[PDB]
mmCIF file of C-alpha atoms in Angstrom:
data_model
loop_
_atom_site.group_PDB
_atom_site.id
_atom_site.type_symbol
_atom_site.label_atom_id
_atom_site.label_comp_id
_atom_site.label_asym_id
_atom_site.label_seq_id
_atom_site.Cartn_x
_atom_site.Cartn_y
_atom_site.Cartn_z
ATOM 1 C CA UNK S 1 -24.958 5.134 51.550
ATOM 2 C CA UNK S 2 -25.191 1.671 53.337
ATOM 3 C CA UNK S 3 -27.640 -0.535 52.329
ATOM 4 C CA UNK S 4 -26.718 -0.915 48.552
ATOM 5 C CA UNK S 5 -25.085 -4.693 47.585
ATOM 6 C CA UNK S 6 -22.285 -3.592 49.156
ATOM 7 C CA UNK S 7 -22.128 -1.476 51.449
ATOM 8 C CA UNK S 8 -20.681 2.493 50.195
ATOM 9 C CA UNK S 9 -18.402 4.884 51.665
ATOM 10 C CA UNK S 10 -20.161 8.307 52.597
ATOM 11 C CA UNK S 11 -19.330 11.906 51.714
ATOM 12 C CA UNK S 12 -21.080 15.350 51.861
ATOM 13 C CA UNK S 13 -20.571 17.908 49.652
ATOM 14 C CA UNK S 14 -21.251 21.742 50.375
ATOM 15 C CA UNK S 15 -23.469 23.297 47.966
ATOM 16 C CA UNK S 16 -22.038 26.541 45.607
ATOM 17 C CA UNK S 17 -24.102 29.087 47.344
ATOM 18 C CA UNK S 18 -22.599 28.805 50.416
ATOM 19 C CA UNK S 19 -19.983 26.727 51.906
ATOM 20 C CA UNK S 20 -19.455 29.263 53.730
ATOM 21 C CA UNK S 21 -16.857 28.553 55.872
ATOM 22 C CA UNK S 22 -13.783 26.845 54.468
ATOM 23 C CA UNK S 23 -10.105 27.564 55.040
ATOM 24 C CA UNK S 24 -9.079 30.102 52.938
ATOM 25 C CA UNK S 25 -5.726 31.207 52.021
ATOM 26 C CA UNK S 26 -4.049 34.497 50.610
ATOM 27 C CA UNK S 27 -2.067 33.510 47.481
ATOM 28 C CA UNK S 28 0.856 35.764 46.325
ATOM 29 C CA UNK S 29 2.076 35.045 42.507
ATOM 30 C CA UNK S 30 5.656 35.835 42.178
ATOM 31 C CA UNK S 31 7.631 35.935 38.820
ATOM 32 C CA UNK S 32 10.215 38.311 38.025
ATOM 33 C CA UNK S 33 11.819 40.286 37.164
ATOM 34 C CA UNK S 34 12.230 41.984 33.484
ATOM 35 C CA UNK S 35 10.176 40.327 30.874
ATOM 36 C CA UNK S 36 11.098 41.805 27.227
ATOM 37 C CA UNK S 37 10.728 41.518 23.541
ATOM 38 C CA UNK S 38 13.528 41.600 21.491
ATOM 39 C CA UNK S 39 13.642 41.626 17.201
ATOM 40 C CA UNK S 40 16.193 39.740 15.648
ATOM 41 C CA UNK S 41 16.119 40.297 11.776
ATOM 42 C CA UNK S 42 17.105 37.481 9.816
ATOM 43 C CA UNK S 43 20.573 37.554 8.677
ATOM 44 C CA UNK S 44 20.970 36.908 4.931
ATOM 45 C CA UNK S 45 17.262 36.533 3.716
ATOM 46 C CA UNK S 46 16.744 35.665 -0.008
ATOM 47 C CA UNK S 47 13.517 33.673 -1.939
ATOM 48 C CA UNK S 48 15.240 30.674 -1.483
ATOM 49 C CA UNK S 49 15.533 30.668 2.622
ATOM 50 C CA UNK S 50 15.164 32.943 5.968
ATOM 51 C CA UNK S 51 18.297 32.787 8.446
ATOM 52 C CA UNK V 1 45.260 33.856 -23.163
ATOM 53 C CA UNK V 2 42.007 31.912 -24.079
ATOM 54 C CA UNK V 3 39.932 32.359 -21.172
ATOM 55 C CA UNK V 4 36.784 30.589 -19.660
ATOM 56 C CA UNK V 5 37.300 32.345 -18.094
ATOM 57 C CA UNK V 6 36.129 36.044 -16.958
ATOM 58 C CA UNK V 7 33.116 35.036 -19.163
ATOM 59 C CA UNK V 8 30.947 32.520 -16.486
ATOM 60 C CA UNK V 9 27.650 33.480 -14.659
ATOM 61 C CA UNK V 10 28.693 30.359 -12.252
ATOM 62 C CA UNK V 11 30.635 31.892 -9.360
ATOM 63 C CA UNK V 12 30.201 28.901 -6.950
ATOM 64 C CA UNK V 13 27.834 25.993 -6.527
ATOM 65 C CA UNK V 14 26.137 24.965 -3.292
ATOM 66 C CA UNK V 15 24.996 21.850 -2.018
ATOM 67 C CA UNK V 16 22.537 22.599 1.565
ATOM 68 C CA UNK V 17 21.193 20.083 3.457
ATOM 69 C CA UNK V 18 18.492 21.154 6.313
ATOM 70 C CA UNK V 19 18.873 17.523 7.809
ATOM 71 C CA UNK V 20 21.698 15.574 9.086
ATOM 72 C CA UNK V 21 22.119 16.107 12.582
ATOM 73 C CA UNK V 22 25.490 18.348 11.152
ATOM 74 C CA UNK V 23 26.755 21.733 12.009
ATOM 75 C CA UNK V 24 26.244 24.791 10.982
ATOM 76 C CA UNK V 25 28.766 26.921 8.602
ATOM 77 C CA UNK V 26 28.208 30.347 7.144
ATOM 78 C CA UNK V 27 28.138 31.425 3.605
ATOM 79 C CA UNK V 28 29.852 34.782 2.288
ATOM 80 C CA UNK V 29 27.703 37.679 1.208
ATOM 81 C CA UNK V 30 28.637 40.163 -1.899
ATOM 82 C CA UNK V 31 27.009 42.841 0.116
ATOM 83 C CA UNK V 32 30.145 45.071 1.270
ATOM 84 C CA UNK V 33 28.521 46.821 3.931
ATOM 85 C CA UNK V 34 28.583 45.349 6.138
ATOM 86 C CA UNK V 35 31.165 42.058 7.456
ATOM 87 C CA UNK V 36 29.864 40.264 9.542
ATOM 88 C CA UNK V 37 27.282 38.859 9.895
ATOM 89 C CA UNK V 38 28.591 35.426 10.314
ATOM 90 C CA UNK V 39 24.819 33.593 9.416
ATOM 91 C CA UNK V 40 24.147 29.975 10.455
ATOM 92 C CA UNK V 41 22.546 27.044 8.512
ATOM 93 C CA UNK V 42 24.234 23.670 7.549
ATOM 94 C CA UNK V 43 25.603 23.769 4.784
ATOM 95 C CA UNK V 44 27.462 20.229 3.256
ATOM 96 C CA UNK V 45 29.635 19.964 0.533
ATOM 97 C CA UNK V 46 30.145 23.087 -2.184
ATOM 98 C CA UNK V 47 33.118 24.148 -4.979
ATOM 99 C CA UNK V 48 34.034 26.976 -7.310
ATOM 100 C CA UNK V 49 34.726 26.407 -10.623
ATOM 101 C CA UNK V 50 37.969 25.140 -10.985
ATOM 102 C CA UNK V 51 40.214 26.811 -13.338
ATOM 103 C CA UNK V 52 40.910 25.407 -15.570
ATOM 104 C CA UNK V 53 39.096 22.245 -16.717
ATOM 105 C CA UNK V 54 38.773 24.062 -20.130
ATOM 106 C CA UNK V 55 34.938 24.086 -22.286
ATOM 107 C CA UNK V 56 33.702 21.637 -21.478
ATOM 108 C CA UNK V 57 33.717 22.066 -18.430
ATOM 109 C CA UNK V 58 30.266 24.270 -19.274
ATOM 110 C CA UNK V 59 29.117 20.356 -20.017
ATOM 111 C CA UNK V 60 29.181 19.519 -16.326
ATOM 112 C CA UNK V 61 30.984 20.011 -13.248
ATOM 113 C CA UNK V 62 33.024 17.297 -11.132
ATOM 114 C CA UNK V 63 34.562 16.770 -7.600
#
């Protein structure tokens, strides 16, 4: 760390395998309530343009 | 009478403009069934033919 020029700031870093222990939180998503799909048909359609 | 009548194809004209900030009027149908639907698009300046202006008036149209 230390040592270089100047001297660096110092972290460690858990590897993926195992951490193992970390604090760990139960997450609840919440969005609601009805979700839908509605149709509207264009009104007046024609070759020359879609309302 | 002289008419020019019952005889014309050209039952309106219709200048549209899908720009100018504007707002939006709706067009008639010929459809009958059903009235309603008011539609929506922008929709600028537009004329019948004005009886009479007499042929030629087949030569060009004026406001």
């Amino acid at each position: 760390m230390s040592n270089s020029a100047i001297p660096l700031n110092v972290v460690a870093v858990q590897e993926p395998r195992l951490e193992l222990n970390n604090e760990r939180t139960w997450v609840v998503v919440k969005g609601g309530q009805q979700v839908t799909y509605y149709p509207f048909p264009s009104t007046s359609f024609s070759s020359n343009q879609f309302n | 009478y002289p008419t020019l009548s019952n005889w014309n194809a050209v039952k309106t004209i219709q200048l549209v403009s899908n720009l100018l900030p504007i707002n939006k009027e709706s067009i008639p149908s010929f459809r009958n069934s059903n009235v309603g639907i008011i539609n929506a698009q922008g929709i600028l300046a537009d004329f019948v033919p004005l009886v009479t202006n007499g042929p030629e008036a087949r030569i060009s149209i004026d406001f």
